[PDB]
Amino acid sequence: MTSRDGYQWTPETGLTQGVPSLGVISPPTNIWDVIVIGGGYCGLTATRDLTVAGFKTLLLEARDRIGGRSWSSNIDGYPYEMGGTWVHWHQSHVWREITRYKMHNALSPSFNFSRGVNHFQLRTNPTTSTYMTHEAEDELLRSALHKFTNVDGTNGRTVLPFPHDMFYVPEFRKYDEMSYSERIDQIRDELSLNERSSLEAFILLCSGGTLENSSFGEFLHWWAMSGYTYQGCMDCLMSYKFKDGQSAFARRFWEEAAGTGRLGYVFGCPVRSVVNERDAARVTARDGREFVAKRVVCTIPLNVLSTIQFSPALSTERISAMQAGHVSMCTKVHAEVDNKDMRSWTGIAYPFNKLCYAIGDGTTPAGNTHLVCFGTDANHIQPDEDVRETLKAVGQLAPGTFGVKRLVFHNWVKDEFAKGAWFFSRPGMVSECLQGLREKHGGVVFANSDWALGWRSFIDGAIEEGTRAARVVLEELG
Amino acid sequence: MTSRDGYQWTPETGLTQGVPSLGVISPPTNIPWDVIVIGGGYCGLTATRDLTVAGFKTLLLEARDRIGGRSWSSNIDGYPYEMGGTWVHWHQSHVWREITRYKMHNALSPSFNFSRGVNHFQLRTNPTTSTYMTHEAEDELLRSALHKFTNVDGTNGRTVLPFPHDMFYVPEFRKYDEMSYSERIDQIRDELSLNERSSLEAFILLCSGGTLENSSFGEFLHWWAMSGYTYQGCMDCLMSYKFKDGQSAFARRFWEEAAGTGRLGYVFGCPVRSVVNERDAARVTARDGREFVAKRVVCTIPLNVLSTIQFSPALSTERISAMQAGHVSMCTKVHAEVDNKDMRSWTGIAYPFNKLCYAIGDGTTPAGNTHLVCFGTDANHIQPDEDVRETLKAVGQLAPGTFGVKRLVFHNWVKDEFAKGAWFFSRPGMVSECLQGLREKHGGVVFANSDWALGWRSFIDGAIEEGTRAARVVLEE
Numbered sequence: 009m010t011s012r013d014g015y016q017w018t019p020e021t022g023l024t025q026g027v028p029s030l031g032v033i034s035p036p037t038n039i040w041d042v043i044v045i046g047g048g049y050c051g052l053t054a055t056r057d058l059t060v061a062g063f064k065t066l067l068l069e070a071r072d073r074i075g076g077r078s079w080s081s082n083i084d085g086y087p088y089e090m091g092g093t094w095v096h097w098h099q100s101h102v103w104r105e106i107t108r109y110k111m112h113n114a115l116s117p118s119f120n121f122s123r124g125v126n127h128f129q130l131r132t133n134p135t136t137s138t139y140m141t142h143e144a145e146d147e148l149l150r151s152a153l154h155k156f157t158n159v160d161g162t163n164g165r166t167v168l169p170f171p172h173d174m175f176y177v178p179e180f181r182k183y184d185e186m187s188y189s190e191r192i193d194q195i196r197d198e199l200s201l202n203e204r205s206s207l208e209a210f211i212l213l214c215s216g217g218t219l220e221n222s223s224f225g226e227f228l229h230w231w232a233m234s235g236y237t238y239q240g241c242m243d244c245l246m247s248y249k250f251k252d253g254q255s256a257f258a259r260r261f262w263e264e265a266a267g268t269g270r271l272g273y274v275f276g277c278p279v280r281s282v283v284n285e286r287d288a289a290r291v292t293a294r295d296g297r298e299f300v301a302k303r304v305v306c307t308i309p310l311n312v313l314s315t316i317q318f319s320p321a322l323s324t325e326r327i328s329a330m331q332a333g334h335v336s337m338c339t340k341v342h343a344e345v346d347n348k349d350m351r352s353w354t355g356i357a358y359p360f361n362k363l364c365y366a367i368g369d370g371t372t373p374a375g376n377t378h379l380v381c382f383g384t385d386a387n388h389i390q391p392d393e394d395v396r397e398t399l400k401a402v403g404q405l406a407p408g409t410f411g412v413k414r415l416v417f418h419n420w421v422k423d424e425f426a427k428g429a430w431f432f433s434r435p436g437m438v439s440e441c442l443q444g445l446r447e448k449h450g451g452v453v454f455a456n457s458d459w460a461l462g463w464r465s466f467i468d469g470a471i472e473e474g475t476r477a478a479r480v481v482l483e484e485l486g
Numbered sequence: 487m488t489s490r491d492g493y494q495w496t497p498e499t500g501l502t503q504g505v506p507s508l509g510v511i512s513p514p515t516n517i518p519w520d521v522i523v524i525g526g527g528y529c530g531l532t533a534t535r536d537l538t539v540a541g542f543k544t545l546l547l548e549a550r551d552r553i554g555g556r557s558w559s560s561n562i563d564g565y566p567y568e569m570g571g572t573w574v575h576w577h578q579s580h581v582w583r584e585i586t587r588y589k590m591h592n593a594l595s596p597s598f599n600f601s602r603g604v605n606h607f608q609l610r611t612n613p614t615t616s617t618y619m620t621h622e623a624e625d626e627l628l629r630s631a632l633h634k635f636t637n638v639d640g641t642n643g644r645t646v647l648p649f650p651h652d653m654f655y656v657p658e659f660r661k662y663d664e665m666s667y668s669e670r671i672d673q674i675r676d677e678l679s680l681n682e683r684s685s686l687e688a689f690i691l692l693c694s695g696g697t698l699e700n701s702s703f704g705e706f707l708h709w710w711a712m713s714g715y716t717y718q719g720c721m722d723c724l725m726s727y728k729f730k731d732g733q734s735a736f737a738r739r740f741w742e743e744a745a746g747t748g749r750l751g752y753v754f755g756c757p758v759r760s761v762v763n764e765r766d767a768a769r770v771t772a773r774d775g776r777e778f779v780a781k782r783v784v785c786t787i788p789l790n791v792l793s794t795i796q797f798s799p800a801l802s803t804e805r806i807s808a809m810q811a812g813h814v815s816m817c818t819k820v821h822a823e824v825d826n827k828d829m830r831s832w833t834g835i836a837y838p839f840n841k842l843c844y845a846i847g848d849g850t851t852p853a854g855n856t857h858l859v860c861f862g863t864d865a866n867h868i869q870p871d872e873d874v875r876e877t878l879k880a881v882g883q884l885a886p887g888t889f890g891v892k893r894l895v896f897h898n899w900v901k902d903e904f905a906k907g908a909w910f911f912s913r914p915g916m917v918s919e920c921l922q923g924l925r926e927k928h929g930g931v932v933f934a935n936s937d938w939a940l941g942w943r944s945f946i947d948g949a950i951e952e953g954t955r956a957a958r959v960v961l962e963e
């Protein structure tokens with residue numbers, strides 16, 4: 009079935025809105041111990057866990073589909089990943105779900121250097137290009153990232169030995185309070201233009217924000233989780249994806265919860281308020297429908313929380329977090345291109361372009377190279393507003409080398425049920441707000457990847473929180 | 487309470503058998519069944535936990551007087567001595583998931599602590615001399631040796647084994663599973679110094695628990711790939727972080743969750759001898775003769791113990807081959823509470839002349855003394871219970887004239903009829919040939935064990951991976 013989310017473009021058709029996805033459900037309602045608000049991976053995991061354990065559970069979702077910030081669209085036999093894509097066995101919670109659902113052998117490597125141009129193209133201004141082996145690329149980045157992360161002599165292993173517990177070493181704090189910008193000023197004189205351009209594009213790829221509004225320490229956190237090495241990051245952040253797309257993975261959570269016969273659900277159901285009552289909680293949609301359950305697991309994203317009325321009011325720490333917002337404003341654009349040899353191309357174009365990092369990520373059934381392109385708040389584009397400028401930004405990644413057959417993207421920034429992409433914090437925000445984002449609220453359990461402990465902001469972190477949310481509810485009732 | 491497993495030695499008390507463990511279940515029973523789970527190790531504990539929480543009436547039948555199997559801890563004078571499986575990391579999916587779900591992510595200790603004391607690595611290649619080194623220099627030497635050992639494909643195994651969960655993804659990988667440790671060393675011999683080769687062999691033998699000749703090179707590549715294809719990755723995953731309250735506190739979490747569903751039946755001290763599949767049901771018979779019936783059976787008995795069990799209908803050709811050959815890990819693990827405070831920051835390799843080859847300062851008891859953990863392998867084997875003097879000699883040769891022993895603690899895994907080996911490690915070619923047969927349906931018997939996991943095979947993680955698969959399979963109803 010075809011979702012309301014997403015955009016597609018071809019030369020023949022122009023820009024159309026709405027694309028297919030297995031995430032679309034399916035019949036939109038089939039209508040409690042528990043209400044779960046939101047059906048991304050956090051909500052899916054909580055719901056799966058709770059229904060399997062014997063609770064009647066109602067899932068309320070604003071969209072016409074499951075998956076939230078992660079979901080895929082099969083177009084002409086090719087899964088286009090609209091948001092969260094990549095997974096790895098070094099990621100505990102997603103991996104456990106992958107193997108339990110027997111999908112550990114249903115993955116593809118995004119990188120294929122076995123034919124074609126097999127180079128990295130670095131663009132530091134609009135006129136000119138630098139070419140490089142992928143090896144040389146790997147090494148440009150290791151060298152840059154070593155300097156960026158070596159605040160303690162051990163690339164973070166001393167100040168953050170236990171990433172799950174940021175205050176184990178009291179001293180990590182100053183790094184959470186530091187911006188990318190402040191860090192770079194410290195190591196500046198020691199970086200070439202090539203190292204710095206590569207480094208800035210890489211760290212901003214990770215934050216989706218700006219040099220000034222991105223927490224250095226949050227990046228140290230990603231680095232630490234990944235093995236405190238550049239190759240560790242690439243393995244964990246960008247190497248392996250589902251062959252059948254993230255939506256086939258979300259479906260497995262959905263099918264299991266449904267198979268218990270304890271699942272109620274409503275889609276197209278944007279929640280407007282959550283009010284604690286005597287021994288229960290009442291959730292009301294924008295259109296006035298009301299639902300009641302003993303406990304509510306609320307998985308609305310940080311950047312959307314300020315749209316909801318809660319009673320009692322949320323705590324002071326929750327309020328600051330949501331008013332400030334996280335900074336990831338990532339624009340992600342897929343491009344089906346007519347250059348077959350670009351399967352093995354990668355490119356960084358920084359800082360002049362609105363898309364700054366792109367990779368050949370696959371080959372469609374039609375035989376065309378698929379490129380994925382990323383842009384950040386550093387030089388922002390809204391990919392839907394002016395196709396001409398979006399195309400010009402894709403092309404500038406490799407001027408004069410290809411024509412575009414198709415674009416596919418979803419706009420996360422302008423999307424009212426996301427308002428941003430994956431979580432990334434401002435300097436000081438996690439230090440300050442994480443405990444609060446995570447604290448009790450009577451009968452409401454706030455659970456989201458945005459405030460995970462481990463792979464925070466990742467599909468993994470959604471699953472971690474989701475599991476934690478089910479466990480809390482279980483303990484409180486039973 | 488005190489288990490019958492394990493041993494303790496002090497100058498004052500001699501050698502005593504039996505040591506405390508929170509893993510001991512008292513009382514030893516609380517008794518139709520949907521599922522019988524044979525074995526209360528991490529694999530049995532996971533499958534039972536999952537099955538009972540999901541609503542199944544489950545009977546757990548365990549040979550020992552305790553849970554944990556090849557992993558369990560003993561609190562002696564307020565210190566947890568890890569008798570088997572010890573270390574965990576967040577790059578191990580299954581164990582970590584259980585740790586965070588049980589909220590024990592913040593209940594870990596670092597084994598390594600280089601912040602005071604002798605702070606050096608001691609390498610011994612003959613009984614009369616030592617070579618002293620910094621920890622940095624130690625890391626460097628092993629990083630260099632291991633780079634040469636693993637660089638079969640130009641990228642330290644990343645090309646031939648990109649998805650360790652699927653070993654045959656690259657068909658070229660098989661030839662390496664069929665190689666032995668010694669086959670690979672001989673290929674690079676002329677490029678390794680004594681110090682590089684001594685360190686290398688000690689490290690790779692530490693991982694296999696067997697000999698140069700019977701350890702699969704490919705299987706070491708599998709551990710290497712799971713850890714991140716680096717030496718630091720291996721250290722992080724293999725030996726860095728342990729539970730501050732001991733592995734047995736961790737297993738008790740699976741137990742209490744299972745117990746509190748009210749759907750758990752159990753019999754400790756109950757060794758099984760036979761499992762026969764009947765019509766839509768299956769019958770399990772103890773040694774004493776007790777019979778149990780359930781619709782399906784999850785059997786978590788270790789590979790090396792399986793041939794003691796009698797199955798009907800009979801197991802397949804590849805299962806039989808696997809259980810006759812047996813895995814090679816004959817690891818000896820001996821704890822020494824010693825009187826040298828400065829050895830907190832010590833590590834040593836003594837190879838190949840000593841019966842314990844690898845050892846580390848691993849903590850400090852509440853009494854104030856250094857805890858050393860020592861390993862030996864089938865390359866130069868000691869049976870630590872058979873003669874205390876010989877065991878003290880082995881310990882003392884890791885660093886002669888530097889300490890007196892106040893206490894030893896250990897369990898003999900090799901002479902344990904319910905393990906008959908330590909963690910799984912394969913012979914050349916065994917995993918290629920046998921894995922799938924070890925994984926395969928068997929009527930109403932589902933065989934599950936760390937020994938035949940896909941990812942962290944032979945690890946606690948692998949037990950949990952397998953226990954999880956086993957609970958899922960059972961439905962199926």
Ligand SMILES: Cc1cc2nc3c(=O)[nH]c(=O)nc-3n(C[C@@H](O)[C@H](O)[C@H](O)COP(=O)(O)OP(=O)(O)OC[C@@H]3O[C@@H](n4cnc5c(N)ncnc54)[C@H](O)[C@H]3O)c2cc1C
Pocket residue numbers: 045046047048049050051068069070071074075076077078090091092093094095245277278279280307308309312338340420424425426428429430431455456457458464465466467468469470
């Ligand atoms: C472009 C992009 C790229 C990414 N890259 C990766 C990657 O490579 N790997 C990775 O692991 N992660 C990646 N991420 C991270 C991302 O996948 C998230 O961290 C994760 O999916 C969040 O899941 P969640 O369940 O915590 O929240 P979400 O997925 O946002 O789900 C919660 C949402 O609650 C619903 N909701 C919101 N408001 C309301 C309301 N008012 N009423 C009812 N329901 C409401 C949303 O519609 C429902 O889907 C990426 C994300 C994006 C956007």
Ligand SMILES: Cc1cc2nc3c(=O)[nH]c(=O)nc-3n(C[C@@H](O)[C@H](O)[C@H](O)COP(=O)(O)OP(=O)(O)OC[C@@H]3O[C@@H](n4cnc5c(N)ncnc54)[C@H](O)[C@H]3O)c2cc1C
Pocket residue numbers: 524525526527528529530547548549550553554555556557569570571572573574724756757758759786787788791817818819899904905907908909910934935936937943944945946947948949
């Ligand atoms: C010395 C040592 C050090 C190790 N180091 C580490 C480490 O640092 N980190 C790590 O992750 N792993 C380590 N390992 C790996 C190890 O802990 C195992 O891989 C894992 O614990 C096996 O779990 P399992 O539940 O699959 O099997 P087990 O725990 O072996 O299986 C459960 C067992 O089945 C029972 N049983 C056997 N026969 C019968 C019978 N006839 N009837 C009834 N019950 C029977 C056993 O008594 C019961 O406990 C180590 C192991 C050892 C021995």
